[PDB]
Design a protein around this ligand. Structure first.
Ligand SMILES: Cc1ccc(C)n1-n1c(S)nnc1Cc1ccccc1
Length: 134
């Protein structure tokens, strides 16, 4: 076992708050915000050795990232930002920091009860996205 075990599985979005506002803060344009905000993604998280894979799948975009904790990688986000990402585990929270164009956003994922809660922060704006097991 590893502590990241509680994240592994197939998850489906059950609620969202403030995601449009988060996307505005990140710089996402109108049409992408509308289509991305309508998406009902499934998140598939798996671990193989030291490599964690997170897939996001929806009618808007299918993405896949694989990474080792603490080891920077380059990522193309669903909204087509080219970012440099680093993901760490901080007291049981997966903390994903994305840097681009002198900007930064942080995505935190944690288990709470039977949920996987995703908190997306860009400056003072937070969106909370709740996933449950599929
Ligand atoms: C905000 C975020 C971070 C990581 C992932 C996978 N997600 N995500 C969630 S949660 N729901 N849709 C997405 C893709 C998404 C990402 C950025 C902008 C628009 C859409």
């Amino acid at each position: 076992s590893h502590m990241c075990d509680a994240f592994v599985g197939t998850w489906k979005l059950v609620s969202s708050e403030n995601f449009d506002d988060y996307m505005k803060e990140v710089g996402v344009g109108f049409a992408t915000r509308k289509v991305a905000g309508m998406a009902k993604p499934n998140m598939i998280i798996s671990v193989n050795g030291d490599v964690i894979t997170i897939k996001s799948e929806s009618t808007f975009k299918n993405t896949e990232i694989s990474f080792i904790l603490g080891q920077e990688f380059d990522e193309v986000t669903a909204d087509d930002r080219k970012v440099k990402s680093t993901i760490t585990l901080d007291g049981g929270v997966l903390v994903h920091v994305q840097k681009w164009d002198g900007k930064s956003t942080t995505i935190k994922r944690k288990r709470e009860d039977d949920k996987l809660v995703v908190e997306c922060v860009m400056k003072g704006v937070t969106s909370t996205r709740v996933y449950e097991r599929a």
